[PDB]
Symmetry: D2
Subunit: 251 residues, 4 copies
């Protein structure tokens, strides 16, 4: 097993088609012991986490709640063991209200909404790292999810701003994580099926030399599992691109 | 002149040593008609803008105030003329509370403080563009101030995050500005010795912080092939005035680096 | 004048349509004293340089010839004056044989041809800087021409590789140029005017769509003006960098 | 095994301390069947490759020789089997004469020498891909070695130019490799008046890297190459994976 005898925290599992669900599914197949995180509808989330190959304890974590943080170390240790520590952390949380992304114009999004998105998508990565680093083993790995924000695109708008902030946050999380001997990295994925949206998706498969399947979330789930393993021990504060190679191609 | 017969809005002038003051000073020397922006101390700021080569009207703007942004364009047109429009916009506003940058650890900054910084440093650029684009001429230019956030560095911490957000905002401001035929660009400057920067060197933030900022400034002059003067704010001012002119008409959503070439050098 | 009382060396002025010809035209309008260089057909090049607003001395410069590069500076000083020096240098010589770019597959280009392309497009920038830096004034400027090579595209093939090399060369030229107080920068332009015919069309159409301020493939004056801005004293803190005159297309996905 | 039942071509093995040597060693430990490449001094390479955990056939490949590149595809097939194909390709070839890198000034390197370096370090990657792609399986991987050329540094001079060219070549190799369903990627490694600048670079690298950097250890970069040769990075192409301890993402 690629992740044999590793304790990994996986956050933001809501559906069975999610990359977050597949990361957990692939990790369990590779011999990893998981601890899962639920945002709000925990009863709804428990029905989905039961489709997973092995049993994993579900913990309540509202990334915006301060009390949920700090208690997000004690609650983890009680689930795994008194002397046992975490070997991996998967941050699969990303949100932006519709005012900030979609049909709504860039200028028409109010700050309160874009602030909510930066908190949940970018700040929360530093928050999760602050709470989980004291209970992490040397050689550990924190993985976040990104969508290449280096260039502006239609509809994505303020979520591109939240992603740019995440990239900067990850570089600083790596500095704090390095003193624990833990790696911090981001996984930039291509479009995942969760008029303009069709144009962006079609463009990706054309640009990607090996092509891109918007319906398949296992190639990105495997990329996260490669970063959670000891096969990338010299990679930190970096972005690993699982987009079929589209970002390196103009046409 | 380089900016002859151009109407430019210059924001965030608080001192006489500021890059924002030196933009306005160089612009007036190049034949530009200015409109200046104030935060809270209106009488105190107007008394700092009297040191400028030519006369320029002052206007109240609190980027956090929605009324101040909605009253804009109208208050600008009344200052310049009924049929006259703006040719340039200078966004020289950047803030982050000390919890987010300095000696305070990255993890110890609360969200409310870092949210205040992103609002004032990154979001405000889109807000100023939203309010001023309808009263801007085709071939116009919106200029913002940046500090290279592509790599993490000590003390900067969350201001680096706010700067990364500004870079992304600038790319989207360019899309909206393009519809008016207006350019939107950022100027990435090297370290500038402000009043706060003179204090953190003097030991106001401690011996640990006083070494970090020194190590950064010394390293910048070494990396820059043409060198870098932390005390001189005119080479960055001139770079902004090149972007406000018609000599860079095919540059949009981009970052122009006035750091002595340090960002392209490892050692 | 933006370039008033400045002595600038301009290279690669073969045709009247060239950005190199426009750079010289705009520079002369801004009060600059030029020194021009030709590749081989100096008789035909002199009939082209006669269409420039002001008079400028012609010089023979085969950038592949070592004797021609060693002969530079002396030949330049004799044209301008014994005590006078150069304030600007515009490198506008980019080449790649058709085996390296176009319809011909990437793998089918022989090394001898791509080597010729790297020599003329990338290495020559360092060579021109080596020869002209001792006769350049502090606050001077060396400007090169680029086309964004950060992402692979059809037809450009090995010329994209030669451009990537030029970007790296520019960063090292800046180190040597800094010692003289001279700046070194590149200008990345947008596209300038059946299978190949469709590819280039798809690229040009896409560029005007991506560019928020739009892009005119027929107009070479916005890129010429960008070079002139870099030749002036209005960008004195910019070195080893790439200034993008592409309408903002490189910062836009769609 | 991470590379179980995979046939991988490993080029440029000259010493028992090389990353190329450690890539081959780690791959054999992960269950991979190797085919090795030797430049000229075959008696020296055979001695070094004997120290490897398992047996692997040695093939002669002067990457500058056209006949060697044209006959390579068949010579690999004869070593593995008449019906078998390659699953991985490791390009561990990088050279630049001392005129192009070291104490010698940037301007003083003649073109003939820098041309030799671009041929061996950047062009050869496209040449090796041209020769080996027809005998490669879908889901395959071509891996090259890089040293971050995005910023200029002392001494590395013209080799930084050859590396920038490799990065551009890699993006185009990905286009050709994609047609075969093969991935093409580069691994940017950290360091593995002369001494006064190399020391200042190595010391600075361990300081910048948040997890630190060991200039004496070549196994973390060898493991990174083996991760790219596996099926755990199937959506990565024309990209650069950085095994430098995270130094490239840090200013100080
Ligand atoms: C076209 C504008 C909209 C309305 C969205 O954007 C997309 O669908 C884009 C084109 C992409 O398909 C991305 C692909 C993706 C998926 C997961 C993580 N990073 C990127 N989706 C999200 O960012 C989506 N991200 C996540 O839900 C997310 N999930 C796990 C971890 C981090 C996340 O940002 C979401 C915010 O975006 C959208 O639904
Ligand atoms: C980590 C050390 C501290 C304590 C600071 O950061 C600095 O002093 C950095 C190293 C630089 O000196 C920069 C220089 C600079 C100044 C204005 C625009 N771009 C760059 N300062 C600011 O960005 C400073 N901001 C501005 O003054 C600013 N002014 C006009 C427009 C945008 C700005 O961010 C501010 C963040 O600097 C600091 O207080
Ligand atoms: C792939 C299609 C072909 C067949 C060519 O490429 C183009 O037309 C590309 C897509 C662009 O239109 C660029 C636009 C350009 C032109 C001059 C300087 N920077 C950018 N052309 C060259 O690079 C062209 N270069 C120059 O003329 C050039 N001129 C002065 C200095 C350096 C140069 O590369 C040349 C390589 O372009 C082509 O022949
Ligand atoms: C200090 C200045 C000199 C004189 C050299 O540069 C170094 O030793 C630098 C600082 C690094 O140690 C790098 C690290 C490295 C090692 C292998 C592949 N990419 C990067 N070595 C080379 O590039 C070295 N290249 C390789 O060993 C190499 N090996 C396999 C595949 C590609 C390569 O370039 C070589 C060019 O470096 C040097 O001889």
């Amino acid at each position: 097993g690629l992740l044999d005898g590793k304790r990994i925290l996986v956050s933001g599992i809501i559906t069975d088609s999610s990359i977050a669900f597949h990361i957990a599914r692939v990790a369990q197949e590779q011999g990893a012991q998981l601890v899962l995180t639920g945002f709000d509808r925990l009863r709804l989330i428990q029905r989905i986490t039961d489709r997973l190959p092995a049993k994993a304890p579900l913990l309540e974590l509202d990334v915006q709640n301060e009390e949920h943080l700090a208690s997000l170390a004690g609650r983890v240790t009680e689930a795994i063991g008194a002397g046992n520590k975490l070997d991996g952390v998967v941050h699969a949380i990303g949100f932006m209200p519709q005012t900030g992304m979609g049909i709504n114009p860039f200028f028409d999004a109010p700050y309160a909404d874009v602030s909510k998105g930066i908190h949940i998508s970018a700040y929360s990565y530093a928050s999760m790292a602050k709470a989980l680093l004291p209970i992490m083993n040397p050689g550990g790995s924190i993985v976040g999810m990104d969508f290449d924000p280096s260039r502006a695109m239609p509809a994505y708008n303020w979520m591109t701003v939240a992603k740019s902030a995440l990239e900067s946050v990850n570089r600083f999380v790596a500095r704090e994580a390095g003193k624990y001997g833990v790696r911090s990295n981001l996984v930039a994925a291509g479009p995942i099926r969760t008029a303009q949206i069709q144009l962006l998706e079609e463009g990706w498969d054309q640009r990607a030399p090996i092509g891109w399947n918007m319906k398949d979330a296992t190639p990105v789930a495997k990329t996260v599992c490669a970063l959670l393993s000891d096969w990338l021990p010299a990679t930190t504060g970096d972005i690993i691109y699982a987009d079929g190679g589209a970002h390196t191609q103009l046409l």
